[PDB]
Every structure is written in structure tokens, then in C-alpha cells.
């Protein structure tokens, strides 16, 4: 769902064409800023097949 007005992430804000990463457990999307993941970090995980979980799913 690419809805530009839908609220996402810990911060409850739209995607705003910002870098976002999808949690491999809840499948929701998170701004890299809010979970501490830069584009370089997230692309590297995706390229290497390394799964990532948001902070809530980790706990």
C-alpha cells in the first residue's frame, strides 16, 4: 500500500517518499530514521538475504 497519506512506523507519519524498511515479522514499514537504519545499511541486509525485525518485533 503506497497510499501517501497512510500513517506508518513508530512515529505515526506518512512515507513521504523517505527511505523505509519492511519488518520481516510484522511486515509493516518503518522509516530508516526511526529504527536507526540508513539506506546503505538496509540495502546491504536486503542484498545479503539477512532478515531484519523492528524494535517491537525484536522484543
Amino acid at each position: 500500500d503506497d497510499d501517501p497519506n497512510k500513517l506508518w512506523c513508530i512515529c505515526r507519519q506518512p512515507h513521504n517518499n523517505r527511505f523505509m524498511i519492511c519488518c520481516d515479522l510484522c511486515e509493516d514499514w518503518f522509516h530508516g530514521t526511526c529504527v536507526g537504519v540508513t539506506k546503505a545499511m538496509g540495502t546491504d541486509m536486503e542484498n545479503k538475504g539477512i532478515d531484519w525485525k523492528c524494535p517491537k518485533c525484536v522484543k
Binding site: 512515507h15 517518499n17 523517505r18 527511505f19 523505509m20 524498511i21 519492511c22 519488518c23 520481516d24 514499514w29 539506506k39 538496509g42 540495502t43 541486509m45 536486503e46 539477512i50 532478515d51 531484519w52
Partner: peptide
């Protein structure tokens, strides 16, 4: 983990 807006 899928990603978007990575340019």
C-alpha cells in the same frame, strides 16, 4: 527485509 526509496 524489503526496502523502498533507496536511491
Amino acid at each position: 527485509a524489503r526496502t523502498k526509496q533507496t536511491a
